[PDB]
Amino acid sequence: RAQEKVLQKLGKADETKDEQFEEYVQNFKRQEAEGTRLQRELRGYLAAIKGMQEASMKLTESLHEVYEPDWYGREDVKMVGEKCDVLWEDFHQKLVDESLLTLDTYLGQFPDIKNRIAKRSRKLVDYDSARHHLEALQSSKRKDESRISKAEEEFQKAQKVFEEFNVDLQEELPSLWSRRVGFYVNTFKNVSSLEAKFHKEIAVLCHKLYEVMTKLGDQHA
Amino acid sequence: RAQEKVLQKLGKADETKDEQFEEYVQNFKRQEAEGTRLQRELRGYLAAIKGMQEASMKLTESLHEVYEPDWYGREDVKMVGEKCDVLWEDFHQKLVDESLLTLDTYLGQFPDIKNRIAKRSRKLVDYDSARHHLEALQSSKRKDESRISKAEEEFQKAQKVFEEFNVDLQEELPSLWSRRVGFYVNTFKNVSSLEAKFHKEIAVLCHKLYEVMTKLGDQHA
């Protein structure tokens, strides 16, 4: 350093880079909170799907139970009930195995990053301390070479250790932030495609039940 | 009566008719229990529909909230959410106003019938008692005309009062039992037709969401 003020300029640059990094961390926290909220709501949706499945089944069971042997369509009602339950079961399971699983694995990458952010902060405090200490030693009236040399080693090491954590996270945080859209797109492509298909397939069975009831009605006219 | 054994033969016929009536009452009880069970399950189904509606809405709300201004399709996502909620709202309400209301009114006819069945039983005990009493008076060693005449009036009245309740319920119970099928047919025609239509209409919106997500995905490719 010396009269080129190298370490002082280093500190200024480090501070500007750290301000940018704290902006990344704010986005990272927002991204985690958004993901966890989506997880809660997707889980809520799955539980509502299952509730629908079960309530629908009981309803068709109760119809099959009031049926008389002579009534048209008893076996068709049973089959409608069975096929509908399979549709619900598969729809729920495919949502679990796609959108939910993918979201859980996406969220699974956050705790390790949070731990390395924590380590980076601590290592920055050590690096900051070593830089200031070296600056002080280099500007003193007494010039103690053995003392300065050791402070140089300590500064070089603290810097290396900090920058290891820093350069990785400087890459990883904005990249993870960028992947946000692809993650939401794929989650909702999965939800919407499975649901579209489910609604189309179950309509066929609703129509079959209507048809059976029409014929039962006609039989008893 | 006298030596033609009129009152004794009357009692035999009354007993055979009463055995048939008790068979009607068993069916009536079964019919009420079937209806109440169907009411419970239909209510359960409606509550599951509402749960689905609400859980679906939160899910789309959370998507709209993560959206960035530059992202394709923000207004389309909002509109999908709004239109889906209207579909759910109307589907639930039409089920309330048709199948549920109709079932509630159908079940509403049972308590008055149960009360008249109760009255009939009591009036049958009085009628039974008056018939036996008249039989006893008519066969006695002492023939007391003023006594017999009064017992005749009491028998005639108790019979009239019983038969008022009896002939109505003898008509109403099998008729109500016969209406069972039409009631189940109309309940499930309503449920299945509304659901078929709902599933068809909401599939369109699921496809719209998939389309928007596809274009959002493409935009960020």
Side-chain angles (χ1 to χ4, degrees), chain A residues 101-118 120-139:
Chain A
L101 175 62
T102 300
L103 168 51
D104 285 345
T105 62
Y106 167 84
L107 286 177
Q109 74 193 308
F110 291 71
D112 174 60
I113 292 171
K114 290 166 83 177
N115 295 328
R116 299 153 49 205
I117 284 164
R120 178 190 165 283
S121 283
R122 175 80 181 85
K123 297 313 175 197
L124 177 54
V125 175
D126 293 343
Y127 167 40
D128 179 87
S129 180
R131 187 182 55 79
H132 282 108
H133 183 53
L134 181 53
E135 283 181 350
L137 289 183
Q138 282 182 340
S139 57

Side-chain angles (χ1 to χ4, degrees), chain B residues 117-118 120-140 142 144-149 151-156 158-159 161-210:
Chain B
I117 284 164
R120 178 190 165 283
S121 283
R122 175 80 181 85
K123 297 313 175 197
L124 177 54
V125 175
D126 293 343
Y127 167 40
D128 179 87
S129 180
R131 187 182 55 79
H132 282 108
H133 183 53
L134 181 53
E135 283 181 350
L137 289 183
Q138 282 182 340
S139 57
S140 55
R142 305 296 179 279
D144 183 321
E145 292 307 330
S146 82
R147 255 187 94 192
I148 289 169
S149 296
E152 267 157 351
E153 299 181 12
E154 295 170 345
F155 162 78
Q156 290 290 346
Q159 173 176 246
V161 175
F162 165 70
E163 289 299 349
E164 266 155 32
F165 281 96
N166 190 45
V167 302
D168 280 348
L169 290 165
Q170 266 175 326
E171 184 284 329
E172 286 177 38
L173 294 189
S175 171
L176 173 51
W177 177 253
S178 268
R179 292 199 290 278
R180 227 160 76 265
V181 64
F183 174 76
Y184 297 143
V185 161
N186 285 318
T187 298
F188 285 88
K189 275 179 173 184
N190 179 251
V191 175
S192 64
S193 58
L194 286 173
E195 199 165 334
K197 178 57 164 178
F198 167 78
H199 289 300
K200 172 189 191 301
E201 288 192 278
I202 197 157
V204 177
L205 293 165
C206 296
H207 285 303
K208 170 57 61 172
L209 183 54
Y210 185 86

Side-chain angles (χ1 to χ4, degrees), chain A residues 37 41 49 52 62 65-66 68 71 88 180 185 189 192 196 199 202 206-207 210 213-214, chain B residues 37 41 45 49 52 62 65-66 68 71 88 180 185 189 192 196 199 202 206-207 210 213-214:
Chain A
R37 177 185 63 198
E41 312 293 14
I49 285 164
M52 191 75 118
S62 76
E65 295 181 38
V66 300
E68 304 290 355
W71 290 8
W88 281 109
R180 227 160 76 265
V185 161
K189 275 179 173 184
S192 64
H199 289 300
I202 197 157
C206 296
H207 285 303
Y210 185 86
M213 292 297 98
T214 300
Chain B
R37 177 185 63 198
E41 312 293 14
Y45 188 50
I49 285 164
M52 191 75 118
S62 76
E65 295 181 38
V66 300
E68 304 290 355
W71 290 8
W88 281 109
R180 227 160 76 265
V185 161
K189 275 179 173 184
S192 64
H199 289 300
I202 197 157
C206 296
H207 285 303
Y210 185 86
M213 292 297 98
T214 300

